[PDB]
Amino acid sequence: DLTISNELTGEIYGPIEVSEDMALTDLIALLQADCGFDKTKHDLYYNMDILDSNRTQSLKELGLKTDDLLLIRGKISNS
């Protein structure tokens, strides 16, 4: 049950079942798909801070889990 929040639109995306053997990318996939994630103008926050292109370290590498979360930030006024 991972919590995504659309920090721009104010939506709250629901208990996503994350398996550590998922692809953080496939997660970002749903994130872009449903959450409206757009790395190309967003900032996604993990825990308290933005990810990076260097942060190619997966769910299991990030430290994602039973109480994890992404946030969708960035854009025009925020980034």
From Swiss-Prot:
Domain of life: Eukaryota
Induction, per UniProt: By DNA damage via PDR3.
Cell compartments where the protein resides: Cytoplasm; Cell membrane
Domain called Ubiquitin-like: residue spans: 1-79
Miscellaneous remark of the record: Present with 6510 molecules/cell in log phase SD medium.
Family listed: Belongs to the DDI1 family.
Subunit structure: Forms homodimers. Interacts with RAD23. These interactions are mediated by the UBA domain. Is also able to bind ubiquitin and polyubiquitinated proteins. Interacts with the SNAREs SNC1, SNC2, SSO1, TLG1 and TLG2. Binding to SSO1 is promoted by the phosphorylation of 'Ser-49' of SSO1 by TKP1.
Job description of the protein: Aspartic protease. Appears to act as negative regulator of constitutive exocytosis. May act at the level of secretory vesicle docking and fusion as a competitive inhibitor of SNARE assembly. Acts as a linker between the 19S proteasome and polyubiquitinated proteins like the HO endonuclease and UFO1 via UBA domain interactions with ubiquitin for their subsequent degradation. Required for S-phase checkpoint control.
Protein known as: DNA damage-inducible protein 1
Organism: Saccharomyces cerevisiae (strain ATCC 204508 / S288c) (Baker's yeast)
Residues shown, of full length: 2 to 80 of 428
